[PDB]
Design a protein around this ligand. Structure first.
Ligand SMILES: [Zn+2]
Ligand SMILES: [Zn+2]
Lengths: 143, 143
């Protein structure tokens, strides 16, 4: 069901990061009516910037659009559960909800954490496609 | 005693952030022989970038200098105890030691946290000067 079109776009965009050896992650920020306002992909290693995960990129995008650091009436949708750096960045701009498709433990160590709802997206098919994408990425990099 | 000259430089540099309404924070990264390799100040609101705290700025500086994300044989010296976003960024580049002059609770909420030593700098005089700086900043902004 949920976010089928949005997840289609995010999954398709996350592939663009594989060129530059970045983990394929993409995310967007939506308003109360599920309109996408900002879209971003992971570009840390592409631009040699420790901060340029997809989450911080989309946050900075909406900040530039609104000329405001208060993003409290928007929500974030990401393909992969954010890291603690990006999690803290999300809480500092006052976004109260993170929808994620794949949790942080399927490919790594679980994150340890009130003011922020962390919701798993129910869409086994999109989740399966994206997990396939990540598996291919990691095994092709171990090469 | 400790880091008297380095703290003099950091405190003097942190003043440059007050122009652009940024919290006066400055930091550097040193090697095993206490040579400064990278120096940075806080510029979040100056450049509308949620990530541009002084810690992430100095990390990105050293990354550009070394063309490497492995900073495990360097340590970080900051005037103010880092936030959790910057803390996670520091741990992700594998810096194992953070020297801080003023802890996070004197002006805010205490941070809640192994692989990372968090050391308070013993220098009551520099600490007093910097605390004075921060007090003047915050009260002048409440205006
Ligand atoms: Zn992240
Ligand atoms: Zn910070």
């Amino acid at each position: 069901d949920d976010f089928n079109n949005i997840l289609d776009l995010l999954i398709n965009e996350s592939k663009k990061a594989i060129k530059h050896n970045d983990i394929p992650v993409s995310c967007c920020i939506i308003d109360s009516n599920n309109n996408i306002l900002s879209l971003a992909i992971n570009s840390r290693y592409k631009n040699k910037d420790i901060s340029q995960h997809a989450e911080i990129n989309v946050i900075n995008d909406l900040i530039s659009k609104l000329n405001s650091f208060n993003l409290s009436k928007y929500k974030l949708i990401t393909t992969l559960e954010p890291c603690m750096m990006c999690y803290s960045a999300i809480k500092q701009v006052k976004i109260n909800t993170i929808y994620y498709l794949v949790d942080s433990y399927k490919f790594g160590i679980k994150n340890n954490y009130q003011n922020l709802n962390l919701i798993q997206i129910k869409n086994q098919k999109k989740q399966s496609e994206y997990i396939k994408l990540l598996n291919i990425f990691f095994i092709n990099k171990r090469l």
